[PDB]
C-alpha cells in the first residue's frame, strides 16, 4: 500500500534504452547551457570593459572641459592687452586655436556616443542570454531528475554496472 509512479517503460531493456535516450538528451542540454554560460560570462566581462571605457571618455572630456575653463580665464587679459598695441593677429590665432580645441571635444563626444550605443546593444544581449538560460534550466533539471530515476529503477531491479555504463557513456 505504497506508491510512486515515475518510470514510463516496464522492462530491463526498454528502461535501459530510455536511460540511453535521456542521458544523451541531458548531456546535449548541458552542452547548450555551458555554451551559453560562456557567452554570459564573456558578455559580462565585455560589458564591464565598455563601462570603464565610458568612465575613461568622461574623465578625458572632463580634462577638455578644464582646458576650456582655463583658456577663457587665462586669455582675457592677453586679448585685451594685444587689442591696444594693435596685434589683431595674436587675438585671431588664440580664438582659432580655441575653436580647434572645441572642435576636437565634439569628436570625443561622438566617440563616447558610439560606445554608449554598443553597451546599450550588448546589455540587450546580456538579458537575452540570461532569458535563454532560464528557459533551459527546467528542461536541464527535469532531464537530470529523470535520468537519475531510471538509474535508480534499474539499480533496484539489480542491473549490473557494465550494462548501466554502456547505456550512459
Amino acid at each position: 500500500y505504497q506508491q510512486d509512479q515515475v518510470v514510463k517503460e516496464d522492462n530491463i531493456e526498454a528502461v535501459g534504452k530510455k536511460l540511453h535516450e535521456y542521458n544523451t538528451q541531458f548531456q546535449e542540454k548541458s552542452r547548450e547551457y555551458d555554451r551559453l554560460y560562456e557567452d554570459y560570462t564573456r558578455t559580462s566581462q565585455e560589458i564591464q570593459m565598455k563601462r570603464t571605457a565610458i568612465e575613461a571618455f568622461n574623465e578625458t572630456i572632463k580634462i577638455f572641459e578644464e582646458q576650456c575653463q582655463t583658456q577663457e580665464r587665462y586669455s582675457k587679459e592677453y586679448i585685451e592687452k594685444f587689442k591696444r598695441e594693435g596685434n589683431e593677429t595674436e587675438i585671431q590665432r588664440i580664438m582659432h586655436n580655441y575653436e580647434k580645441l572645441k572642435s576636437r571635444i565634439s569628436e570625443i563626444v561622438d566617440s563616447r556616443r558610439r560606445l554608449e550605443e554598443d553597451l546599450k546593444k550588448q546589455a540587450a544581449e546580456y538579458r537575452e542570454i540570461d532569458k535563454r538560460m532560464n528557459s533551459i534550466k527546467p528542461d536541464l533539471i527535469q532531464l537530470r531528475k529523470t535520468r537519475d530515476q531510471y538509474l535508480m529503477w534499474l539499480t533496484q531491479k539489480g542491473v549490473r554496472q557494465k550494462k548501466l555504463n554502456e547505456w550512459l557513456g
Binding site: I47, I63, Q71, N97, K100, N134, R144
Partner: protein
C-alpha cells in the same frame, strides 16, 4: 601603422595636435612638443619643459601623472592619445603610487570610492595604515633582518662528505675554488674565502650568482637547496661574496535580547527579471548560520512573470530578533514556477548585522547572482558570497526592507555582555565513544560540553556543530567556553576555517592557533588560506589581517599572495574583496610593487604575442608563424618588457635575456608559448606561457605532490620528485616551469627504448644512479597519482629527466574524474629491474618504497582532507562536494586500521603487477 596623432593641452589654454611615434618615450615627445609650441601662441609664458609633467587617462579610466619620462607611449597606453601638461606639484609619491596600484591590480582605485561604502572605506583606511606602518618599521631594520625579509632562506626539510666550491667577489674577474665539507656553517666558508691574498667575514653574505638566493644563518651547507641540488648531481657550487653595505643599497625603499518580536521582512519588488511569460515568479527566503538553517524557509505568492514584478509581502520567519546569531544570513532565491491551475532563476545573500555589529534596517536592494543548476539542487544557496553583484546596471535584483525594530539602533552584544550570560560516569563512557570515532548524540555532547573542554580539546568542531545557534541563550554558553578554550594544533585550526564555522569568534580562534606557523609551513597552505577568504562575511577580518601580516614579514609569501589574488581579479564575486587586499599589500610593499609591475607587463606582452600566434597558425604554416613571432619579439617595447625580470614562478630566479631564436609555441590545444632565457651573471631558464585554458587544477595537484615530497623527506625518504612551478596569473592565463633536459615517454619511444635512452644520458657508472632516480620517482608518482585519483595517464603526459627521474604533467582530471586503480606499467617495471626478467631484490625495494610512501601519507591523512575541504571554496568542477573529499578518505583508507590498510594496498599493488603484463599484449 607606427605613428599616432596625439592631443597636447598646454597650461595657457593652448592646444596642439601633431603625430608622434608609438615607440617614442615621453621625454622625447616633450622635446618635440616644445619645438612645435614655439610657433603656437602664448609660448613666452610657459616655463621650461622640466617644470611640467604629462598627464593622461590610463586604461583604468584614471588620471595618471607620468613622472617617469623614460617610459614609452605604447607602454603608457593612455585611453585616447591625449597628454596634458600640469605642474610638478604636491605629494607626488602618494599620487604616483595610487596610479601604479590601479594599473597593477587591474582595478582602478576610484571604483572603490565610487561604491560610497563605509565598509570599503573603513577597510582601505585601517589596512593601508597598517601596511604602511609595517613598511616604515621594516625600513629601519638592519641588513641581516632585511635579507631575511627580502630573500628568506630556502632549506630542505644526513652524511658528512667533502666536495669543493667556487667562491668569488662582486665586480672581480678572479674567482677562488677550494675544498669544504657538506656540514660546514656558511660563516666558516666566508672566513676561508675572505683570505684573498694573505674587512671581516661577519659583514658578508653568500649569494648564489645568477639568482636572488642567499646563504646565511645558523644552518649547515647541505640543508640549503642550491648546495643540496648541486651535491646530488655532483656539480661545483658557484657562490659570490656580497658586502653588508651592498645590501643597504637594496634596502633603500620608501538591548538586542530585550527585542522578543518575531523576525520579519518586507519583500517589495523585483527588477530586470528575464523569464518565460507563461510561468510565474516566486521568491523563497530562508535564514542561515553557516551551512545549517536557523528556522523553516518561508515563501511568496505566485506573481506573474515580468521584468519588474511587485510582491509587497510581509515575510515572517519562525524565529525572534533576539534569537538571531551574530553571523545570521538572510538568503533569497528567485524561482520561475508553473501556476498549477522548477526553475531557479537567481539568488542573493545578506548579513542581518553589518560590519560594525549593527542589526541592519531600512531598504536594501540586493543585486542577485544567477543560479547555476548543480547536482545538489537546493532551494537556497547559503554558501554563496554575501557580496553584491557588481553588474548593477544590467543584472537582476530584489528590493527588500528590514523594518525598524526600535527607535534607537541596536547592536549585537559585546564580548563582556556575552561572557556575563555565559558563566551560567555513564556519561563519560557514552561521550568518549562518540568523540572516539546525530540528534540523540548532539544533546549528550551539549549537556557534557564542559567535559569536552577539559578532556576532548580537539573535538571543538563537533561541539560547535551540535550547538543550537538559533537559540541565543545557547550561543552565549558556547562562546563562553570558546574564549577560554585551550590552543589546538595547526591541524585542528585548518578544519575550523571551513564555512561550517562562520562565527567571528571561531575564525579568530582558528587564526590564533595558526600563528605558530612557520613561513615554510604557511606557504604549503597559502593557496587554501586565500580561498577561505571567499567564505568571509565582512572585508575587515582576522584572516585578511593574518595573511597581510605574514605577507609583509616575508616577501616570498607576499609574492604568491599577490598572484593568487591577482589571478582572480576578473571574477566578479571576489574582485572587490581581493582588490582591497592587493592595494594594502602594495602600500606596505612599494619595493616589491616595482618587481610585480615588471612581471605584469611581461605577462601582458605575452598574451598579445600568444593571440598573434593563435591567429597566424590558422592562416599560415608554423615556420613562417615562428619567424613572425620573433619579429614581434625583436621590437624595442616587446624585448625590453620580456627581458630582465624576476620570474613569477619563482622570484629568486632571474629571467635576464630572452633567446628569441629559441622561442616558439606548441601546436597544443591553446598554442602555449615556449619562452627561453639566459643570464651571463650565472642559468638557462625556460617558461611556458599558457593562455586560453585554466591552470588552477594543475597548481593544486603540484602543491599536493610538493607536500607529499616534504612529508616523505621529513621521514628521511627523498623519492626524487619533480614538483615543477605552475602559477595562474590571470583569466585563463598562467606560467608553467620548463624542466630542462626532459622529454615525454612517447617521444623517447618514437625515436627496449626507454632503457637505451638512459644509456646515452648516463654512460658507464652513471646508469646505476639513473635507475635508482627512476625507481624512487616511479614509486612516489605511482602513489601520488593513486591517492589523488589522477586518471588519464599515458606516454604524452608522463616525462622523464636525463638524470633518470620520472614525473607526471597535465593534471586536468583528478579524484577519479569511479575509482582509478593503482597502475604499474611494464615499461617502467622493465627499467626498475635493470632490464632483467626477474630482479626481485630490486623489485622488493620498489615495493618497499611504495608502501612506506603510502604509509606516511595516511599518518598525515586529515591534513589532506582538511586542505581539500577548504579548496571546495575555489569552485573547481572536480572538487565541489563531500564525494570528492570521500575519494581521499577511501584512497588513504583512513576508516581502516594501519595493518588493514597495508594488506589492501598490497592486494591492489599485486593486481597492478598482474594487469601490467595484460595491457602490453
Amino acid at each position: 601603422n607606427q605613428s599616432v596623432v596625439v592631443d597636447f593641452l598646454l597650461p595657457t589654454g593652448v592646444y596642439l595636435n601633431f603625430p608622434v611615434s608609438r615607440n617614442a618615450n615621453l621625454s622625447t615627445i616633450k622635446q618635440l612638443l616644445w619645438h612645435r609650441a614655439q610657433y603656437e601662441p602664448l609660448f613666452h609664458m610657459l616655463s621650461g619643459p622640466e617644470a611640467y609633467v604629462f598627464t593622461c587617462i590610463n586604461q583604468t579610466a584614471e588620471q595618471q601623472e607620468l613622472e617617469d619620462e623614460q617610459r614609452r607611449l605604447c607602454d603608457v597606453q593612455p585611453f585616447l592619445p591625449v597628454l596634458r601638461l600640469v605642474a610638478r606639484e604636491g605629494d607626488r609619491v602618494k599620487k604616483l603610487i595610487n596610479s601604479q596600484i590601479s594599473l597593477l591590480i587591474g582595478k582602478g582605485l576610484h571604483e572603490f570610492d565610487s561604491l560610497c561604502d563605509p565598509e570599503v572605506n573603513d577597510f582601505r583606511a585601517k589596512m593601508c595604515q597598517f601596511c604602511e606602518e609595517a613598511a616604515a618599521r621594516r625600513q629601519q631594520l638592519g641588513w641581516e633582518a632585511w635579507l631575511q625579509y627580502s630573500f628568506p632562506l630556502q632549506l630542505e626539510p644526513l652524511p658528512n662528505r667533502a666536495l669543493l666550491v667556487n667562491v668569488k667577489f662582486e665586480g672581480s674577474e678572479e674567482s677562488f675554488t677550494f675544498q669544504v665539507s657538506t656540514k660546514d656553517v656558511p660563516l666558516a666558508l666566508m672566513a676561508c674565502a675572505l683570505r684573498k691574498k694573505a674587512e671581516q667575514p661577519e659583514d658578508y653574505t653568500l649569494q648564489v650568482n645568477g639568482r636572488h638566493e642567499y646563504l646565511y644563518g645558523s644552518y649547515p651547507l647541505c640543508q640549503f637547496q642550491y648546495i643540496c641540488s648541486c651535491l646530488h648531481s655532483g656539480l661545483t657550487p658557484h657562490l659570490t661574496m656580497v658586502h653588508s653595505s651592498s645590501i643597504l643599497a637594496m634596502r633603500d625603499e620608501q538591548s538586542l535580547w530585550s527585542l522578543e518580536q518575531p523576525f520579519r521582512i518586507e519583500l517589495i519588488q523585483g527588477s530586470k527579471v528575464n523569464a518565460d511569460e507563461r510561468m510565474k515568479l516566486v521568491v523563497q527566503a530562508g535564514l542561515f548560520h553557516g551551512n545549517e538553517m536557523l528556522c523553516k524557509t518561508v515563501s511568496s505568492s505566485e506573481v506573474s512573470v515580468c521584468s519588474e514584478p511587485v510582491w509587497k509581502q510581509r515575510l515572517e520567519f519562525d524565529i525572534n530578533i533576539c534569537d538571531l546569531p551574530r553571523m545570521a544570513r538572510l538568503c533569497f532565491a528567485l524561482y520561475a514556477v508553473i501556476e498549477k491551475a522548477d526553475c531557479p532563476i537567481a539568488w542573493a545573500n545578506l548579513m542581518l548585522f553589518d560590519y560594525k555589529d549593527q542589526l541592519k534596517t531600512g531598504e536594501r536592494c540586493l543585486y542577485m547572482w544567477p543560479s547555476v543548476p548543480d547536482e545538489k539542487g537546493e532551494l537556497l544557496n547559503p554558501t554563496g558570497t554575501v557580496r553584491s553583484n557588481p553588474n548593477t546596471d544590467s543584472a537582476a535584483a530584489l528590493l527588500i526592507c528590514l523594518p525598524e525594530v526600535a527607535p534607537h539602533p541596536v547592536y549585537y552584544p559585546a564580548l563582556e555582555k556575552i561572557l556575563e550570560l555565559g558563566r551560567h560516569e555513564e556519561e563519560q563512557l557514552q561521550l568518549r565513544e562518540i568523540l572516539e570515532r546525530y540528534e540523540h548524540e548532539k544533546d549528550l555532547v551539549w549537556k557534557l560540553r564542559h567535559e569536552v573542554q577539559e578532556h576532548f580539546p580537539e573535538a571543538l568542531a563537533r561541539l560547535l556543530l551540535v550547538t543550537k545557534w538559533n537559540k541565543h541563550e545557547d550561543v552565549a554558553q558556547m562562546l563562553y567556553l570558546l574564549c577560554s578554550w585551550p590552543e589546538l594544533p595547526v591541524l585542528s585550526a585548518l578544519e575550523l576555517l571551513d564555512f561550517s564555522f562562520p562565527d567571528c569568534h571561531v575564525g579568530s580562534f582558528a587564526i590564533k592557533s595558526l600563528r605558530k606557523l612557520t613561513d615554510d609551513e604557511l606557504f604549503q597552505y597559502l593557496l587554501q588560506l586565500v580561498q577561505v577568504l571567499k567564505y568571509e562575511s565582512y572585508l575587515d577580518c582576522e584572516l585578511t589581517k593574518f595573511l597581510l601580516d605574514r605577507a609583509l614579514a616575508n616577501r616570498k609569501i607576499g609574492h604568491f599572495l599577490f598572484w593568487h589574488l591577482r589571478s582572480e581579479m576578473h571574477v566578479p564575486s571576489v574582485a572587490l574583496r581581493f582588490g582591497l587586499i592587493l592595494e594594502a599589500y602594495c602600500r606596505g610593499s612599494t619595493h616589491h610593487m616595482k618587481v610585480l609591475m615588471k612581471q605584469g607587463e611581461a605577462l601582458s606582452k605575452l598574451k598579445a604575442l600568444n593571440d598573434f600566434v593563435k591567429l597566424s597558425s590558422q592562416k599560415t604554416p608554423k615556420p613562417q608563424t615562428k619567424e613572425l613571432m620573433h619579429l614581434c619579439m625583436r621590437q624595442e617595447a616587446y624585448l625590453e618588457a620580456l627581458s630582465h625580470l624576476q620570474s613569477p614562478l619563482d622570484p629568486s630566479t632571474l629571467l635576464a635575456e630572452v633567446c628569441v631564436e629559441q622561442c616558439t609555441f606548441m601546436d597544443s590545444k591553446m598554442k602555449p608559448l615556449w619562452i627561453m632565457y639566459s643570464n651571463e651573471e650565472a642559468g638557462s631558464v625556460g617558461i611556458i606561457f599558457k593562455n586560453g585554458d585554466d591552470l588552477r587544477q594543475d597548481m593544486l595537484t603540484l602543491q599536493m605532490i610538493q607536500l607529499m615530497d616534504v612529508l616523505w623527506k621529513q621521514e628521511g625518504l627523498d623519492l626524487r620528485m619533480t614538483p615543477y612551478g605552475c602559477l595562474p596569473t590571470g583569466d585563463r592565463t598562467g606560467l608553467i616551469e620548463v624542466v630542462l633536459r626532459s622529454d615525454t615517454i612517447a617521444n623517447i619511444q618514437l625515436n627496449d627504448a626507454l632503457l637505451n635512452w638512459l644509456k646515452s644520458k648516463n654512460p658507464g657508472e652513471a646508469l646505476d644512479r639513473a635507475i635508482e632516480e627512476f625507481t624512487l620517482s616511479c614509486a612516489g608518482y605511482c602513489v601520488a597519482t593513486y591517492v589523488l585519483g589522477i586518471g588519464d595517464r599515458h606516454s604524452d603526459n608522463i616525462m622523464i629527466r636525463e638524470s633518470g627521474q620520472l614525473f607526471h604533467i597535465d593534471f586536468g582530471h583528478f579524484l577519479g574524474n569511479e575509482r582509478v586503480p593503482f597502475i604499474l606499467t611494464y615499461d617502467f617495471v622493465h627499467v626498475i629491474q635493470q632490464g632483467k626478467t626477474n630482479n626481485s631484490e630490486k623489485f622488493e625495494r620498489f615495493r618497499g618504497y611504495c608502501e612506506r610512501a603510502y604509509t606516511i601519507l595516511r599518518r598525515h591523512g586529515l591534513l589532506f582532507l582538511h586542505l581539500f575541504a577548504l579548496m571546495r571554496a575555489a569552485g573547481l568542477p572536480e572538487l565541489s562536494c563531500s564525494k570528492d573529499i570521500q575519494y581521499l578518505k577511501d584512497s588513504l583508507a583512513l576508516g581502516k586500521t594501519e595493518e588493514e590498510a597495508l594488506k589492501h594496498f598490497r592486494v591492489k599493488f599485486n593486481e597492478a603487477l598482474r594487469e601490467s603484463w595484460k595491457t602490453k599484449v
